[PDB]
Design a protein around this ligand. Structure first.
Ligand SMILES: [Mg+2]
Ligand SMILES: [Mg+2]
Ligand SMILES: [Mg+2]
Ligand SMILES: [Mg+2]
Ligand SMILES: [Mg+2]
Ligand SMILES: [Mg+2]
Ligand SMILES: [Mg+2]
Ligand SMILES: [Mg+2]
Ligand SMILES: [Mg+2]
Ligand SMILES: [Mg+2]
Ligand SMILES: [Mg+2]
Ligand SMILES: [Mg+2]
Ligand SMILES: [Mg+2]
Ligand SMILES: [Mg+2]
Ligand SMILES: [Mg+2]
Ligand SMILES: [Mg+2]
Ligand SMILES: [Mg+2]
Ligand SMILES: [Mg+2]
Ligand SMILES: [Mg+2]
Ligand SMILES: [Mg+2]
Ligand SMILES: [Mg+2]
Ligand SMILES: [Mg+2]
Ligand SMILES: [Mg+2]
Ligand SMILES: [Mg+2]
Ligand SMILES: [Mg+2]
Ligand SMILES: [Mg+2]
Ligand SMILES: [Mg+2]
Ligand SMILES: [Mg+2]
Ligand SMILES: [Mg+2]
Ligand SMILES: [Mg+2]
Ligand SMILES: [Mg+2]
Ligand SMILES: [Mg+2]
Ligand SMILES: [Mg+2]
Ligand SMILES: [Mg+2]
Lengths: 123, 86, 80, 82
RNA sequence: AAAUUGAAGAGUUUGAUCAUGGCUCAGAUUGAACGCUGGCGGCAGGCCUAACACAUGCAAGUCGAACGGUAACAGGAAGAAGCUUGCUUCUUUGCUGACGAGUGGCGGACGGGUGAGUAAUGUCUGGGAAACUGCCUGAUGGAGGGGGAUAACUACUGGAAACGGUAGCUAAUACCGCAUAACGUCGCAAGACCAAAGAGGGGGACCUUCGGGCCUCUUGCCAUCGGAUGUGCCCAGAUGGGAUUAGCUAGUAGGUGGGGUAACGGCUCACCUAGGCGACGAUCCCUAGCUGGUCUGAGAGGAUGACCAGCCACACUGGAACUGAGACACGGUCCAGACUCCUACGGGAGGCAGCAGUGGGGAAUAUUGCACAAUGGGCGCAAGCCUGAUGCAGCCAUGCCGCG
RNA sequence: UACCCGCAGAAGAAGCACCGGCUAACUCCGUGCCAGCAGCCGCGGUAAUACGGAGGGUGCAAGCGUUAAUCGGAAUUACUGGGCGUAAAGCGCACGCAGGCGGUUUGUUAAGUCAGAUGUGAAAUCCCCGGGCUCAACCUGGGAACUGCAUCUGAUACUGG
């Protein structure tokens, strides 16, 4: 349950470390993004020699949130923080080449198959 | 491991490791019993414990788990101290 | 076969140890002048019989501490 | 262990061997303990070609040094020559 | 007999001069490049840059004479037949020449690569004393009598793969008691205590349970004291620069005692003393593997550390120990990091600074070759197998020398 | 394979830089402070041996030039082996700790210094005399050298105690 100004950690080796959500994509007046949703981000901290830089403006898919995901029998899976994976602005495909921490099967899209394969763990 | 024998060596060294560990843990136990008697001031318990310990620090030396010199110091050291008290 | 050094006691403070300075003249490798050089050795003095300023005869032995590989042989001259 | 063998010097197509006593693990042309003969397989044989300090070879054997197949041959050959 | 018995100057300030002083040239040298040109050969050299990243092959195996063994192929065999009656194909059985997979032994600590780190648990010279040391070697004795397991395999079962789960079952030079036990370890001594393993080759009376006994020799196993080689440790001197770095230090310096190592040691811990280092350059900062030697110079020096050889250090990065005589392991293990590959999505796998080769960087540096024939290494009684060590071949005028 | 014999025919095998002084090698034409050269000086505005072409010549030769790079010449970091009045260089002056140096005699010591002996200073490399590849490079025997270090024993003039 991510909105504008929200800060997210980063679940890849893109070099970003902290990003801010500056837009929830996918509809007029849309309020929140959750696991599986794409956001627009600015990069607030990045490592020295990575694929991206501080102040760069791009997209990312949310892959872990504190609000969690509901499953069909009523269950909940919650994470201790909010993380995302950086995506090319145009192709919306991953910038990084590795993924860190657990992800959820909600990502099983044509689009995010690469993220679940790379993920250490899939919940 | 990549090479055929390298694989085999890792397997053998693990077996040996669990063998040695077992015998080594046993040995230190019997050494520790002697130091514990000494620290309670009993000649007999400590001599008795030294007599049980002797043959096994000796044997583990013969078996390469430790060198001869280590076995000797243990016997020398404990013998020194137990005599110094009773 | 008794290899040995002679020097004077610059410090006698330590318990059973002493610092000895061995001084010698050496030809300068490039400019030929003869220069004083000093070698300080931590030496063993069981019984602490060596006083500062004493001139003492020392010998090399096994390690006695992190920095002591020498022990006292005997005092030569004392209390100048 | 310690072995007596040929370290191959000389040039390409013109082998020349230096007989040496050495720790068998060191490389063939590497660290040795003592040089003890030489062997020219390309000697004109009009004059010399094979020279062995048999006294020091034996001394080293007496202390357990082993001996190459090729040095073991040279020694039997040189013992035959004189 | 001989073996450092060797040393040059020119142009350029001035109208001209002498002095001062820099710049410049003649010389040797090079792991070179580029431009033009280019016939052959012998010997040598060949990523100096990114310790940048690496597809693919290959670079560490071997022993059936330790062991249960057969699945391959090779014969052999009572007995099935090819039968055209000595030629034979298959059903069988390890009977044996061998041998996949497995246990076991020895080697994977050598050989080969690199110079990142390190101004010192480094190197060089010269000395010390407290130690271990596979294979090889001399000496003297052992090698007795037992026991419980297990891989392979069999049955059932999970995986896409990697690789597993159950219960069976079995061998040994795997593993453990027990005995034996000193010129061994502990101990003043009296005493106390410690090991092991078989496997082959051939054979005369003699004979059985036809396995062998027994006879004999080879070989391996155990103990102890030596030799040889290897390694660990300690001290002194030397081994770069900087003060636009002057103070540094609590395991710090020493002492006692316990622990610890193969061994001396603040190696470690407790307690005690308050020391220890430093202008003869400590501390901090920059740089760097050291040497034999190499180039230059008459020399003294200056510069330098490819190729060869010695020592050290490293093995994707940081950390760790396990096995072992030896490693904190170059093609081993574990954790963490960076990165890459496989996947049926659940999970797996790897580390060229070995030899070729690729991308990248660069002014610039080679073939994904042949062979174990020779020398040398590993295993084996041997035969032999393995060996990108090595021997060779290919490429380049890169250099030296020879010839056209 | 090395090497030896035979066959064919001069047949298939010459380029690079330079020529003003330093520096071996000179003329013409073109250009005209342009285009250009240039290690240093310095060439180019109408005779340019200096630019560019040509002929001629010099030096090298399967190479030749240019660039890079170390040492040399450079006595230009001067230990061997230099300087500071006017050329770069005496601190504006004095006191003074550390340090360097220290008059003269005797005795002593024996660290410096000197002598001898012994061990070590790996091999290769360098050098000398030989040997082997048709020669040479290359390979190789023996020597000499490693001018250094260390221990012991002496010498005692000089320096130090
Ligand atoms: Mg103790
Ligand atoms: Mg003039
Ligand atoms: Mg060309
Ligand atoms: Mg070649
Ligand atoms: Mg290479
Ligand atoms: Mg087999
Ligand atoms: Mg055994
Ligand atoms: Mg027993
Ligand atoms: Mg037995
Ligand atoms: Mg102690
Ligand atoms: Mg470096
Ligand atoms: Mg090499
Ligand atoms: Mg090379
Ligand atoms: Mg080397
Ligand atoms: Mg490591
Ligand atoms: Mg061990
Ligand atoms: Mg190492
Ligand atoms: Mg590798
Ligand atoms: Mg390029
Ligand atoms: Mg002229
Ligand atoms: Mg010109
Ligand atoms: Mg003209
Ligand atoms: Mg130059
Ligand atoms: Mg000079
Ligand atoms: Mg001058
Ligand atoms: Mg005047
Ligand atoms: Mg002046
Ligand atoms: Mg003045
Ligand atoms: Mg006298
Ligand atoms: Mg000749
Ligand atoms: Mg020679
Ligand atoms: Mg010689
Ligand atoms: Mg030499
Ligand atoms: Mg005097």
């Amino acid at each position: 349950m991510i909105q504008e100004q929200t800060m997210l950690n980063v679940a890849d080796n893109s070099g970003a470390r902290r990003v801010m959500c500056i837009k929830v994509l996918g509809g007029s007046h849309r309020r929140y993004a959750g696991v599986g949703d794409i956001i627009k981000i600015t990069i607030k901290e990045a490592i020295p020699r990575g694929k991206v830089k501080k102040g760069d403006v791009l997209k990312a898919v949310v892959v872990r949130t504190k609000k969690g995901v509901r499953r069909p029998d009523g269950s909940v899976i919650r994470f201790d923080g909010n993380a995302c994976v950086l995506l090319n602005n145009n192709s919306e495909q991953p910038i990084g080449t590795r993924i860190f921490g657990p992800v959820t099967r909600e990502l099983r899209s044509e689009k995010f198959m690469k993220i679940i394969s790379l993920a250490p763990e899939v919940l | 491991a990549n090479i055929k024998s390298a694989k085999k060596r890792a397997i053998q060294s693990e077996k040996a490791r669990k063998h040695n560990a077992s015998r080594r843990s046993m040995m230190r136990t019997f050494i520790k019993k002697v130091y514990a008697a000494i620290e309670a001031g009993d000649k007999a318990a400590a001599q008795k414990a030294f007599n049980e310990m002797q043959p096994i620090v000796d044997r583990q030396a013969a078996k390469g788990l430790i060198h001869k010199n280590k076995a000797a110091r243990h016997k020398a050291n404990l013998t020194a101290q137990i005599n110094k008290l009773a | 076969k008794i290899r040995t050094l002679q020097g004077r006691v610059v410090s006698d403070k330590m318990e059973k140890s002493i610092v000895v300075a061995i001084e010698r003249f050496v030809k300068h490798p490039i400019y030929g002048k003869f220069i004083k050089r000093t070698t300080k050795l931590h030496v063993h003095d069981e019984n602490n019989e060596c006083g500062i300023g004493d001139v003492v005869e020392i010998r090399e032995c096994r390690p006695l501490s992190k920095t002591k590989s020498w022990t006292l042989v005997r005092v030569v001259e004392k209390a100048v | 262990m310690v072995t007596i063998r040929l370290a191959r010097h000389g040039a390409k197509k013109r082998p020349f061997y230096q007989v040496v006593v050495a720790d068998s693990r060191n490389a063939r042309n590497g660290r040795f303990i003592e040089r003890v003969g030489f062997f020219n397989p390309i000697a004109s044989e009009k004059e010399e070609g094979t020279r062995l300090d048999l006294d020091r070879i034996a001394h080293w054997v007496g202390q357990g040094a082993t001996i190459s197949d090729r040095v073991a041959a040279l020694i039997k050959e040189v013992n035959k020559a004189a």
